[model samples]
Target: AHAFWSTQPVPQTEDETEKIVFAGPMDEPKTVADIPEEPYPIASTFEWWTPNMEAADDIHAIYELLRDNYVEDDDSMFRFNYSEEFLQWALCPPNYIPDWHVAVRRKADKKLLAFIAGVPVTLRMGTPKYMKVKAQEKGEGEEAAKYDEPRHICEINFLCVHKQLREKRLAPILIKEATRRVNRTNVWQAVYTAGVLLPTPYASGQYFHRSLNPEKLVEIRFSGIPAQYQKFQNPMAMLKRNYQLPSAPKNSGLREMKPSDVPQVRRILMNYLDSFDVGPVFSDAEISHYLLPRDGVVFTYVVENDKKVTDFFSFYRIPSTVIGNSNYNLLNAAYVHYYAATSIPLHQLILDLLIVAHSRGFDVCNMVEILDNRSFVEQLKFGAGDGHLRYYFYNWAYPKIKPSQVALVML
Candidate 1:
């Protein structure tokens, strides 16, 4: 219950070893003496990179660690910061490319202390585009219905560790050096998603709804627990009713964004991320290099009716210390990255701009996988719950390529 360091190791400079190529599995090379210097003391040393070809200084240090970890609160709506032109069109590497690699850890006057970002996904033949094609023609050959080839999921995204080095153990040695560099890239199976509870079964998870307010979700306290145990439900029943949006609906007849609205918002967010299956396919120069420079609290919403502009969202505000303290103020937590809509009332005009970002005060709002999003989990079923956030995978090969389900809520 304490491994956080996450990623950013693999970079030894030399123009990031000439265009990044670590190819996974190296037995166990995390160095820095396998990290574990007491509750928090190691000055710094993790490294792992793979974005050469002069990718503008590793895309400006991964867009300044996602704009200094943007997380804006108000329950959460998927904004994980990316803009620097969406990080030079999503980390420039042959258009939305990644095979599970990118690690960082510094300090000794080097600065940037912790990081981890992964990629490697491919599986979209003819049918089974997103799922349910009569369950892939009634599992003709089963064996988990052979996902038709090309599979190696891993998107742990940005992980940080600086605040005077918290807890130590540098996040399980950067998750065992990013699972030994994805088992030496022989392409095994990997997937990640976190919310906190635990119990791994290779992964098949679910749980969504975020409307906080169970008296402010018990008053916040997270990571150290107590926020009414982070509100798991049944606190005398009756708090479940999804469906929001009664505000942000006036982009005034849309139609203004040109440059072909960036490949039509990257083909409508890769066809709405094929209803959430996950990974790669994000090009329009990586969504305009991570979404047109919008620093800090990060915001980008679009939803027009007649004149066009269908829908789009990015949100991100994040910032936390579990729950403010140092003279308060560090709370923010919203995260609704890259949302796309065409109708459903433009997804209720992007859930009414996330219910006007919960009356512009933000304290929570997070969403991932969200199961089947039963209409957004019944519109935040009274401050949602089901607690869980743990994601790990390491299959250099062998029957293991499943893990990739995530659904979080806290608005």
Candidate 2:
């Protein structure tokens, strides 16, 4: 029962009911030199490998490994098929560490078997409310000194193992090797999310999907008609009528984001994220790396007026393989990433964003109940999906955060 997590610096069962006094690092301070210098040893059959992110063959190899063995639904009807360009943009962010892109390969054939990667991020955690509540109970509440400053941390993701070696203890090894590599670089804390629940989570969010192609979704059985709709003979026709979108975006000022808009967008995004209890602080270079309009990988647009950026939104492409579907091979999906709204309403901005995604031929648009996303799901006709994501922090402890307070998005 959570043997690996029990050894990590996370909240245990005991802390679940207890009040948290502070919000920050749970482990004691240690210098980089104090950590192990050598890489952790693995089984002889599998060897450690650092992929060349710039190389085509390496990227393709990683794509192949993940496409066949990465995340899939419980029914095994769909699997994430992240494109090569998407991988390049995500893993090779500004100032990314090559060594942190850890993987394992079979020594006999040199084929990739496991993968995990970490990128540097500056995160801010707010003071726990219980600290104030308990203090007020003691009649000494003055909102205790703020621990709400940003700290450097690692964003870890893409943990996957070959289907053939699911329980060979490869996942834990991959995680440990990644942690060791990051620790040597002086980053003491990390953030990650998963569909599975671990020992503890700082925030939990549910995924909501808005259909852009109702016919395709119905045919694949990825979505179904409501119980009320089953009584009608033309439910498919009703669905198409219900989910139709405008031919063009309603926001007249909306245009594709360009390199020149990076600074403006970065400033707006930073100011917006600062309002959250748990979020990332990004640099200008990081903003350009993540939000710039990349052809098939990412799409970002800004509502510009007077030659200045006012509001912005972005979505990344993550097509899923339609398993056993003879008619359609892939389901193009778009995930809402990061955004900031100043003038226009956030929900209206999302409606315009959906129109843009529809114009790009996406089958569905997915968004987690994070940030300001909760305000628009019901209004925009987004159906709630059963999938839920749990956000976890490694070597850091604090109280639970509401989904609306989560500002970071892991690709």
Candidate 3:
């Protein structure tokens, strides 16, 4: 299924999937001295570039490229519309490398045509007990022994090529260039996700959506009237009532997360993610960069007891262009980011999250079926999305894990 993937170090689809059981780096170890100094070459008409995150002009050029050519629904109805502030926050996370914010441009006009970004992250691979138990049963010896360690990795995302230049095959070059840049920095492993399945996936997760503005969604054709409600006198009204949320959150203890909450929140999140087989190992700085309340980017809330933070939840804003819709220009959508609930029920925490998102003018709240969402998704009126999101690792290998076993969510 993957011509390019076949040559890469990732586990091949044709290989014996069951036999390759241990998890670790797939490629033989190498150092920065062995990496190439030059960026991968493109055609004469295109040149390599790295858009400066702080430059307004650069941000606009990158934004324009993504707005027109980036991800869209299967029906071509909605495309992601990220604001400039959103871009700044997402691309400039803690310990980010400017070289990894890679791009492609026209040689003559310098028009931005493509982009692929990378940021530093630490991931702890949680080996399932079964893998170790099976290794002992097979008598594979000390080499098969499992180890849980935090591995530093590059998080790759925002790979986009201009629609007009899809035939030019710029995506592969972008990937290679990004890999080269990261390798020069001495980070050998990377993690990414795609809407379409490739050679293999570490975990495949389904998306679920909860409509906060049902009328707007129907009018924009982002959603349709329920099949069973088609015969009703006012199905739109029925939907509006069904998806409506309280003006205030049900959990009074929940409040906007503050900068001071980072330490406690990190502790709570680290403890929660310990259960997952695959999850990020977030430092306090990384926690603040991602989850400390930010405008037009992320909204996070926490519940405190005895003057100590005990639980929290968060989601990021990513509006979608409502193509050909006269009444609306954008669909304000919230994507579930991360959460940890210890004192409160998961469903109640999610219900409060929906209420907060609704109060913030979001038309819909979207979540992937990851983490502990199994306890809240259906109970919270979330509808299944048509597509699935698959997680992949570059230069790394691991046994396939379930969606619930995945605790990492890339923006």
Query: Top TM-score: which candidate number?
Result: 3
- Weakest 10 consecutive residues, lDDT, candidate 3? 140-149
Ranking by TM-score: 3, 2, 1
Candidate 2 vs 3: which has more lDDT: 2
For candidate 2, report its TM-score. 0.96
lDDT of 3 at 91: 92
Per-model TM-score, in order, reads: 0.28, 0.96, 0.96
lDDT of 1 by residue, 1-411 (tens): 322421323222234323322123213444544444332223336444444424667667665755555333335422344445544433343433453445454634445555555554442321223333444455633432344444544445555555455567665655666655554554335545555432232233343335533334334533223346336665323322222334434545433234456766677767765653333455576566454434455455555555456666665565554334334434455666656677654445445546656656665566544423335545443233445434433322111122232221122
Ranking by lDDT: 2, 3, 1
Evaluated at residue 188, the lDDT of candidate 1 is 39
**Predicted model with the maximum lDDT:** 2
Instruction: Provide the RMSD of all predictions against the true structure, rounded to 1 decimal.
Output: 20.6, 1.9, 1.5
lDDT of 2 by residue, 141-245 (tens): 543435566888789989999999998777888998999999999888899999997878878899899999999998888888877888889888999898999
lDDT tens digits, residue span 1-411, model 3? 565777788877725344567777788899999987987767888899988898999999988888888899999999998888888888998888999999989899999888999988898774555676777788863645544678888989899999988967678889899999999989998999999988678789889999999988888998888799978888788888899889998877889999999999999999999888888998898999999888989999999878899889999999888789878889999999999999989999989999999999999999888898878877899988999999888987777778899998988
C-alpha lDDT of all candidate models, in order: 0.45, 0.88, 0.87
